[PDB]
C-alpha cells in the first residue's frame, strides 16, 4: 500500500508508458516511480522551490466542478522508435501557458512554449487530446476549455482578445511556434447558455468527442443537458455533431451534471458519471442523485446532429432550430447511487470491468454481465478519510493489476481485485472476477501473473473455463475439473490407487484434496445516520401503527444491489414502532415502509455511515479527579451508540454532533476510551490522569501560581477575565474569592 502525499490538492495526474507517473499538485509538477516512492524529478512552474498555490482555491461542493492550476497534462509520442516520448503540460499561469517538454527528466528545457493554450481561470474546464493529423501526420492537440469567464478583475486580464472571445475548442499544433491555432481550427460558442464545462476528450472511430455540460460558474448550477460534441479528427475543426445524453432516469428533475467520463476502449462504450445538483455539499444528497450511465458510442455517433444549439455553425443561429437528440443509455447497465465521483472502464478476458470512485473514498468495481448488465459492485478499497475521489482514475501501464487512486492530496497504487478472500474454487470462480483465477500449485485464488510460474497454463484456472470446472470428487471415484498434473494418488477409507488415479483423498505432486383500508401516517424515523454495523433499534413515529399485521420496511441503496426488506421488531404504541437494520455497505439508502399491503410509503433517506475513527483528544491529559470535558475530534461521531472508559469500566455521558464531541473525564492513570456501537468497540487514543496541581494565591487583580494539564479559561470559574502563562512556576491573573476547577472548588 504505497502512498504519495502531495502538499496541495492534486490538480492532475498522468501515467507515462515507461517514464513513471506525473502528478501536478500545486504550482509544482512532480514525476514519480510507478511505485509512488521517490519524486525522480520535479518542475516548478510559478516560482522556483516554493510551489504553494499562488492564490487560494475553494474546494467546492462535490458536484460542482473543482479548480486547479494544472489544466493540461498529457504524455504522447511515447513508445516511438527512437524518439523519446513527449509530455505536454499546460498551466493556468502565464495567460494559460502550455509547454511541450521531453517525457522524462523534468528539469530539462521545454522544447516549445505557447500562451493562451489552456483556460487561465483556475475553475475553468479544460480537456485535451493529441492525435495524428495533417499531410505529414504531425501531432496535433485538440483542447476544449473555458477560456472566457465573466470574472475578470481590472488587475489582471486573462480573458483573451475580443476576437477569440467565444472560443471553446481549438486544434493546436504541437510543432508550430507557440502551438499555433489555424483560423478555422477553432470552434466558436453560443453566448446564451452561460459557459460550457468540458469534462473529457477522447478519440473514437476517426473523431474527437468532448463530453461537456452547460454551467453557470457564478451560480453553480447546470443550465442544460449534459452533451457530447463530436468533431472530425482533422486539422481544421469540422463540427460533426452534438448530442445530449439523457441520464436523468430514477430522479425527479434529472441528472444534469457530468462528473466524470471514460471510454471503454475495446468495447466501444462510453461510460459517464452523472449527478444532480446536491444543494450545498450534502443537503439535497438523495439516494438517487448520481448515476453511472453507459452509452453505445455507435448511438452517439449516429444520433449527433449538427445543430447550432451550443456551438456556432455556419448554417443556423443560436438555438434557432432543432434541439439536439437525447441519446438513451444502455438501460440494462445504469447504476444509480447516492454519491459517485469517478469512473474508469476497461476490458479483461472479454468482460467489461468498470471501476468507480465514490464521494466517500471508496473504489468499488462492477463487472458487466452478458448483455452489459451491471452486477452489484464489490468494494475494492476504502480511503480511511472518506475524501472524495479525484475524478480521474489512471491504470498502471506497466503492471495491469494496479490503478492509481487519487484523492484530495494523496495518490496511491491499489490492486484492481481483492481476491484473497476467496479460499476455494467456487469462491474464486462464481464471483466472476476476470482478474482472479484459482491456482492449484498454490491452491489459492490469485491474479494470473502471481501464479503462472508453472509452465502448464491450466495451473491457473480462470473464469472463462467456468466455475464448475474445478477438481471435485466423482462417484468408482475419480477427479473432475481441471487439475494441473496428470499424476496423482487416490486413497479412500481404505483402497488406494495411483496414476488419473482409479474419508476420500486425491493427492497430487504439488497439492491435494480431501472430503469424507385505514389510513397510515408516518411522522418520522430516527436516527437517520445508522453506522455500517446496522442498528438494533430504529424508531418510526406516526399514527395508527397497530392497525396492521404484516408491516415491512424496504431499503434500497444501489439500483443494482438488492433490497433490505425487514419486519417490525416489536410494535409499540400505535404511534411508535421499532425496527432492526442489519450490516451493509456505506451508502445512503432510501427507506419505504409498506404496511399489510399497498404501495411503499417513502419515509425518507437513511444513510449508513463509516465506522467512527478517532482522530484526536483535545486535552489528552486531566487530573485524576477528572471532570474536565475532554473533547474528541474525529469523523462520523453522530452514529456513536455510547462510550466506554476502560482501565474497570466507567459509563460517562456524551454531548456530540457529527465531527466532534465532549464528555467529562470521570475517572476520579492512563485510561483507554472506546466507542461502542452495536456490540462493537473501537479505540480512541489514551487519556492520562495525574494528581491535582499545587497552588499559591495572591492579589483589582489576582495572581495565582501553579507548578501538563492544558487548563484554559472555560475550565476555571473565579467569582469575586483570566490570562495565564508558564514562567518557571506558572502564573495566571484575573482582573471571599471562589475558584472551581473540574470538580475541585476552593480558594
Ligand atoms: C510561495 O508563494 C506564494 C505566492 O502566493 C506565497 O504566498 C507564499 O508565502 C510563498 N511561500 C514560500 C515558502 O515562499
Ligand atoms: C536531470 O537533469 C539535471 C540537469 O543536470 C541533473 O542534474 C539531474 O541529475 C537529472 N536527473 C535525472 C533523474 O535524470
Ligand atoms: C516561453 O517561451 C519562450 C520563447 O522561446 C522561452 O524563452 C521560455 O523559456 C518559455 N517559458 C517556459 C516556462 O518554457
Ligand atoms: C447565470 O449566468 C448568467 C450569464 O453568465 C449570469 O448573468 C447570471 O448571473 C448567472 N446566474 C446567477 C444566479 O448569477
Ligand atoms: C465509424 O464511422 C463511420 C463513418 O460514417 C460510420 O459509418 C461507422 O458506423 C462508424 N463505426 C461504428 C462502429 O459505428
Ligand atoms: C409509546 O411508548 C413509547 C415507548 O415504548 C413511548 O416513547 C411513546 O411516547 C409512547 N407513545 C404513546 C402515544 O403512548
Ligand atoms: C492544550 O490546551 C489547548 C486549550 O484548548 C487545547 O486546545 C490543546 O489541544 C491542548 N494540547 C496541546 C496544545 O497539545
Ligand atoms: C465540554 O465541551 C463541549 C463542547 O466543546 C460542550 O458541549 C460540553 O457541554 C462541555 N462540558 C462541560 C462540562 O462544560
Curated annotation (Swiss-Prot):
Q: Which residues form the Sema domain?
A: 1-416
* Disulfide partners: 28-51, 120-158, 190-318, 247-293, 419-436, 425-470, 428-445, 439-451
PTM comment, free text: N-glycosylated.
Q: Which loops or segments lie on the Extracellular side of the membrane, by the record? A: 1-747
Q: Provide the tissue specificity.
A: Detected in heart, brain, lung, spleen and placenta.
Sugar-bearing residues? 50, 105, 113, 205, 216, 350, 371, 498, 512, 550, 629, 651, 670, 710, 723
Give the source's domain of life in one word: Eukaryota
Q: Where in the cell is it found?
A: Membrane
Family indicated by similarity: Belongs to the plexin family.
What does the subunit comment say? Monomer. Homodimer. Interacts with SEMA7A.
What this chain does, per the entry, is described as: Receptor for SEMA7A, for smallpox semaphorin A39R, vaccinia virus semaphorin A39R and for herpesvirus Sema protein. Binding of semaphorins triggers cellular responses leading to the rearrangement of the cytoskeleton and to secretion of IL6 and IL8.
Q: What is this protein called?
A: Plexin-C1
Please tell me the species this chain comes from. Homo sapiens (Human)
- Name the gene behind this protein: PLXNC1
